[PDB]
Amino acid sequence: AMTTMNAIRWPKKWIPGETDNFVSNEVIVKGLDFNKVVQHLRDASHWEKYYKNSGNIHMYHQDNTILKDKTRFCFETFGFLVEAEVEEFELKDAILRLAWRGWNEAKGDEYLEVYHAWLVEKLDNDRVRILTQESQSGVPAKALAKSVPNAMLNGHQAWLDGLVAYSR
Amino acid sequence: AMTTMNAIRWPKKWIPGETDNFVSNEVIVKGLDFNKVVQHLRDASHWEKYYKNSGNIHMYHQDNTILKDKTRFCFETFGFLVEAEVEEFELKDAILRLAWRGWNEAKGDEYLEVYHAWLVEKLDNDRVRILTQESQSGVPAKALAKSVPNAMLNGHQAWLDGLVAYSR
Amino acid sequence: AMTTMNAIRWPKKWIPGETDNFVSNEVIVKGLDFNKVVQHLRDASHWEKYYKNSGNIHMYHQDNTILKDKTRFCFETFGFLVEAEVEEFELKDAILRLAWRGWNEAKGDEYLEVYHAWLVEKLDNDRVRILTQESQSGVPAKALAKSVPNAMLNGHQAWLDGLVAYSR
Amino acid sequence: AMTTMNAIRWPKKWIPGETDNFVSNEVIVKGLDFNKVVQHLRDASHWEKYYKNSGNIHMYHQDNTILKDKTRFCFETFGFLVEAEVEEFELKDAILRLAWRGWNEAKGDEYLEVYHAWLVEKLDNDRVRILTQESQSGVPAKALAKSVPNAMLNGHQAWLDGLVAYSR
Known part of the structure; x- marks a missing residue:
């Protein structure tokens, strides 16, 4: 048998090592409330409060700021605008999987597209x-x-450090 | 039914979240040679050649600098002298598990003990x-x-980036 | 009498504390050649070779890559394209003053304009x-x-550490 | 004839470029009160309140935490005990010059001595x-x-960002 842990499900085009950049971050924290973390990640209105590299947000077709499957939204990070759409959302009692595709409106060499998973x-x-x-x-x-x-x-x-601090 | 990846085997005292600091890094690289990576991680004489924060090393009971199970050694990193001993070593055709416990010869509040796994x-x-x-x-x-x-x-x-660069 | 050092001459519009962000960095290095540093800073073709956050460059109306007063150019940094124009250039036997105004082609809240002096x-x-x-x-x-x-x-x-390393 | 700004007076043995490490940081902020800044820098009991990387403080011969010339003290930063002594203190209506020499209680290769000026x-x-x-x-x-x-x-x-935020 193997010693393993739950891992992110990547669509084929975003598989790590098959794109232009890949970044991985992880925290494991004692006494942290799962539900608060979930709540502070999904509800995008909290991000600006605990993650200072992010700014304004907008949900185009929702009357709230809670991410769910297919949520189309935009947010500011590092001072620039990111357009995004949730492509994965599965919340169970002990695990949340959430991922969005992100992109900018630039063309040619300035275009950037990403898949950010949690x-x-x-x-x-x-x-x-x-x-x-x-x-x-x-x-x-x-x-x-x-x-x-x-x-x-x-x-x-x-982002991780802020989410942890804000969720205690 | 679960989507998982191989994960480090932690002794009980070192479980992430149960100690004072936990750090996690990962790279996934296309076309990288597995045997070269294993060679450049295991043979500690290469560390100072590709990882700028590492310095002198010494193997106390070996006539070579290749880590294997129970290797007792010392090395400099970030200007600090680390005493260490390999506590895990399992090498297969497709996977390497290697970890050492590290510590300093300080006492009380100056003391630092670590478990560094790969x-x-x-x-x-x-x-x-x-x-x-x-x-x-x-x-x-x-x-x-x-x-x-x-x-x-x-x-x-x-360290990861240097190890990758050096192994191409 | 005062104890003073040479300082950057700022146009009124860019005076530190009167804008939205101010950044200051400085190195002082022994045995480094002044002429070589000026060369590697003024000749923008070297930037990509020692400062890994910078990419391609382009001088719009010069047949060379040597910045002088009013040089119009563009360069890539942090992945984004920056249009620029040298607004200050004074080179003496023992001191160089060089500055450019930089901007992006964006509109509204995405528009950024800077004055980077050396x-x-x-x-x-x-x-x-x-x-x-x-x-x-x-x-x-x-x-x-x-x-x-x-x-x-x-x-x-x-940028500074690279300029130093490359000029030694 | 020269465009200059006030600069720190270094004793000979600490001149930038003649030692093992030099670091320079600077902020310039509109509307900040000089006296408040001076207060929050000299009264080392405020350090903990606005700068998270500093620890306890101790004054060996004073009934107060206000730094002045020859003030003998010790503090913790980066989880390291640094014995310090103020070697420069000149406070005028529009300028403060403050500096301390710090050292640890270690021998040979682990010994560190610094001069930190403001x-x-x-x-x-x-x-x-x-x-x-x-x-x-x-x-x-x-x-x-x-x-x-x-x-x-x-x-x-x-430290600078905390000092500013706290003094605003």
């Missing part, structure tokens, strides 16, 4: 695991992969 | 995954956990 | 100082100002 | 400048000098 789950003895991974395609993604320091890595780490 | 494996379509995770205990671990940027996260990311 | 000078006993400061205006600059970690600060530090 | 000053049009620079000697300083992201640079920027 997996939140309860583990033994009152621990919560938050895994977030992003696969990116386009010329700017090639530049981000070479950046020093790794801006995406630190940015996503700050 | 999982290298071949994935489908000519991809190699390198997962490294570290669990730390002691007062100095509590200070590292608060760093922003996260010092260990960026260090380990650089 | 001061390279010889100091007593074979040391060279490299000071770089940038003032930014626009809604994205307000976001960059609160970013965690500070993206601009770390990127510019990488 | 310059707070009023600038034209209701702006306040806060400049902080640190020069470090010893083997651990050599390691810090190689960190990417630069650990000292990011910690000091956080």
Whole structure:
């Protein structure tokens, strides 16, 4: 038998190692409330409150800011606008899988498209695991992969750190 | 029914979330040679050649610098002297599991003990995954956990990136 | 009398503290050659070779890549295209002052305009100082100002560390 | 004839470029009160309240936590005990110069000695400048000098950002 843990389900075009950039971040925290974490990740109106690299949001076809399957929305991060659509949403009692495709309105070498996935789950003895991974395609993604320091890595780490702090 | 990936086997005292600091890094790379990666991770004399934060090493009871089960050694990283011993070593055709316990010769609140694990494996379509995770205990671990940027996260990311570059 | 050092001359519009973001980085290095540093900063063809956050460059009306007063150009950084124009260029035997205004082609809340200045000078006993400061205006600059970690600060530090490494 | 700004007075043994690590950080903020900044920097009991990376403080010969010339004290940063002594203190109506030498209780290769200087000053049009620079000697300083992201640079920027936010 194998020693394994739950992993993200990637659509074929976003498989890590098959795109231009891949970033992975993960925290495992004792005493963290699963439901609060889920709530603070899904309801996008909280992001600006705990993750300072993000700003305004807009849900185009909803009267609330809660992400569910197929939610079409936009948000600001690192000062620029990201258009997005939820492509995966499955919430069970001990695990949440949530992922959105993101893109900008640029053309040619400035176009950037991404698939940002999340997996939140309860583990033994009152621990919560938050895994977030992003696969990116386009010329700017090639530049981000070479950046020093790794801006995406630190940015996503700050998202995780803020979500944890805000959920206690 | 579950979607999972191979995961590190933690001894009980080191379980993520039960210690003072947990860091997790991962890369997934297309066309990377699995045997070269294994060679450059196992032979510690290569570390200083591709990972700038590592320094001198010494194997106390071996006439070579190749890590295997129970290897007792020391090395410098981030200017700190780490005493270590390999506590896990399992190498197969498609996967390597390697981990060492590390500690310093300090006492009281200056003491720091860590368990640094690695999982290298071949994935489908000519991809190699390198997962490294570290669990730390002691007062100095509590200070590292608060760093922003996260010092260990960026260090380990650089170790991974160097290991990849060096193995092409 | 005062103890002072040479400082950047700012147009009124860009005065630090009067805009939306201000970034300051500085290195002072022993045994570094002034002329070589100026060459590697002014000749933008070197940027990509030592500063990994920068990509392709283009001079619109020069048959070379040497920045001089009023040089109009564009360069890629953090994956985005920056249009620019040199607004200050004064090179003496022991001090260089160089600055450009930069902007993107975006509209509304995505529009960003910056003034990035540099001061390279010889100091007593074979040391060279490299000071770089940038003032930014626009809604994205307000976001960059609160970013965690500070993206601009770390990127510019990488520019300086690279310039130094490449000039040694 | 020269365009200059006030600069820190370094004792000879700490001159930037002549030691193992030099870090420079600076903010310039509109509407910040000079006296408030001076208060929140000199009264080391506020450090904990606005800068999360600093720990306990202790004053060896004073019944108060206000730093002045020759003030002997110790503090914790990065989970490290640093014995310090103020070696510079000059407070005028529009400029403060404050600096301390710090050291640890270690021998040979683990020994670290630093000189951390500050310059707070009023600038034209209701702006306040806060400049902080640190020069470090010893083997651990050599390691810090190689960190990417630069650990000292990011910690000091956080100190400055906290100081500003708290004094607003």
